Structure formats: structure tokens, C-alpha cells
Amino acid sequence: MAAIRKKLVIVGDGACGKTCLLIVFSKDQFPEVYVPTVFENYVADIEVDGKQVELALWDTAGQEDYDRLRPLSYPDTDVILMCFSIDSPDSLENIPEKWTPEVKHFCPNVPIILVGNKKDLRNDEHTRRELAKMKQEPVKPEEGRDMANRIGAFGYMECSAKTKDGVREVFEMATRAALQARRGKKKSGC
Amino acid sequence: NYLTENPHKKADMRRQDSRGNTVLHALVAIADNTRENTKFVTKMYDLLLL
Amino acid sequence: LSNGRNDTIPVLLDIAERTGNMREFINSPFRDIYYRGQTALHIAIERRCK
Ligand SMILES: Nc1nc2c(ncn2[C@@H]2O[C@H](COP(=O)(O)OP(=O)(O)O)[C@@H](O)[C@H]2O)c(=O)[nH]1
Ligand SMILES: [Mg+2]
């Protein structure tokens, strides 16, 4: 009828595929040569259940001087995809440590989807050997499920930008979570 | 007239802002009781409705 | 705006598309809490230049 505008924001460690995830969502064509540090000023059309939603996709990077301007993207945020890398175990443990408190501080009572990207690389021989060099292993799905339960995640999926696996369903569930308008107020003052 | 009807992209009149106010709530919000204001507020309201 | 017409808007837009990122340029919002969300389109409409 009249498309509804919902704000989606991505926060995660660098090199975990956030920008590539949004890009594959946008044009459905993997950029093999050039990837911008951020994907900006885009709105995409999605229909999930009889409702037509324009999703405005913001992107946050922290490489150089973007961290100072990151807080400014959090206001009026409707839904968040907290993202991390499956082929990089270091990404997971920082999510409870540093990413979560900033998200809670600037924008509370917001839905959050914890996602792990690039399922293909966990079975890759090169990444497996590199992790085994430090007596490590790729992030197990069980650990991701436990984390999703642990930090209040609305849902937990996995993406693959190269193979375009699960992006459509991931963003569908993201906008489905966004369309919910929370539950009133809790301990609201007299 | 141009924004609603142009080949590139059309802004439909039924869209609501963050507050939920449609173009008509917005036109009521600026509405005042001076003649200089009502004279065009009512005209634009009828135009958009039709 | 000088007498309703600035000779650099077309050149800026031409350079922007030629440089590859027209989309990100035409609609870039303000970030200060005081003007959040305001677009170049808002300025064009407010200045009353069709
Ligand atoms: N082989 C492969 N590489 C990927 C995939 N997704 C992301 N990458 C790589 O991850 C790198 C950086 O990811 P990026 O989009 O910049 O994540 P960001 O740093 O959070 O913005 C890119 O150079 C890609 O080559 C994938 O599905 N397969
Ligand atoms: Mg990037």
C-alpha cells in the first residue's frame, strides 16, 4: 500500500563482511575488484508478509576516523545486525566485551540479530590450517547459538557473500524483527 | 504537482512521517486562523485530497 | 544562490557522476542534532526554485 521506512544498522569488527553483505543484498553482484569502506545512502524494497518495507541500510566501519563519527548513526535505529566472522574466532569474544555495551548505551530496547559470515571459509583448507597453527578451530555453530541465547539475540543465522547463501532470508527476518514495535514501557515512572 | 507526477519518481500522498502525520495532518499543523494562512491552507488541502 | 541561479550545481553533479558515486552525493543527510536528516532536496524545495 504505502511502503514503511525502517532503519537497519550494521555493527561489527572489520573484515567480517558487513559491507560485502550489504552490497550483495543491494545489487546481488559480488564486487571482485573494488569494495568501499562503507556502503551508504541506500534504501532497498522488501516484502515479507503482505507488507512492503523500504529498508534504509546504514554501515559502520572503524578503520580510520569513522569511529569518531560512528555514534551519530545510532539514533532512530529500528533494527541491528551485529555481525562477526566464522573464519576468525577473535571476532566472537569481543562481541560481549565491547560491541554490546556501546549498542546498549546509545540505542537501547532495539532488536538485534547476531550473524556469522562466510560459512564457506570454515571448511577451507587454508583457514583450517591457519587456525590449527595456533591450536584453534573455526567458530562452531554451537558457540554461535550459545552466544545468541547469551546476549539476547533475536535470531542467529549465517551468511555467505561469495555464494549468496541465506542473505535474502537473513534480511527478511531482520525486517520482520524491525516491524515489531517492542512491548510498551517497563517500570515506566509514575 | 511536479513531485506527485513526474516520470522519474513520484512521491505518493499517503506516506506518513515518523510521527504518523500524513500530508493532511501536516497541513493542519501549520494551519492558522489568519485569513492569509487559511486562504491557502484550505486550497492546498482540497487540491491534495481530490 | 545568486539571483536564483548558481552556475556550479550542474558542474558539481557532472563531476559526481563522472567520479562514480552520484547516488551517495545527491542525497547526503546532515549529521548535527539540530538539522538531522535534511537533504539537498529539502533546500531546493524550501528556496522555492522549481
Ligand atoms: N572468499 C570470500 N571472501 C569474502 C566473502 N565475504 C567477504 N569476503 C572478503 O572480506 C573482505 C573484507 O570484507 P568487508 O566487506 O570489507 O567487511 P568490513 O571490513 O566489515 O566492511 C573482502 O575483501 C572480501 O574479499 C565470501 O563470501 N567469500
Ligand atoms: Mg567496509
Q: What residues does A7 pair with on adjacent strands? A: A56
Question: Per the CB < 8 Å rule, is A2 touching B18?
Answer: no
Q: Is B50 helix (H, G, I), strand (E, B) or coil?
A: coil
Question: Per the CB < 8 Å rule, is B12 touching A2?
Answer: yes
- If 0-12 CB within 10 Å is exposed, 13-18 middle and 19+ buried, where does residue A120 land? middle
What atom in ligand 1 is closest to the CA of residue A118? 27
The answer to whether C36 faces chain A, any CB pair under 8 Å, is yes
Strands A52-57 and A42-47: antiparallel
Mutate to test the pocket of ligand 1, among A13, A20, A70 (most ligand atoms within 8 A of CB): A20
For residues A135 and A177, what is the distance between their CA atoms, to the nearest angstrom? 38
User: Which experimental technique did the depositors report for determining this structure?
Assistant: cryo-EM
Query: For residues A25 and A1, is the Cβ–Cβ distance under 8 A?
Result: no
Q: What residues does A118 pair with on adjacent strands? A: none
Q: Which fold has domain A4-179?
A: Rossmann fold (3.40.50)
Question: Per the CB < 8 Å rule, is B16 touching A2?
Answer: yes
Query: For residues A30 and A17, is the Cβ–Cβ distance under 8 A?
Result: no
Domain boundaries, chain A: 4-179
Question: Could you tell me the three cell numbers for C38?
Answer: 535534511
Contacts of A144 (CB under 8 A, 6+ apart): A86, A92, A114, A116, A156, A158
Residue A156's alpha-carbon distances to A73, A95, B11, in angstroms, are: 23, 14, 36
**In three state form, how does the secondary structure of C6-36 look?**
CCCHHHHHHHHHHCCCHHHHHCCCCCCCCCC
Query: For residues A71 and A11, is the Cβ–Cβ distance under 8 A?
Result: no
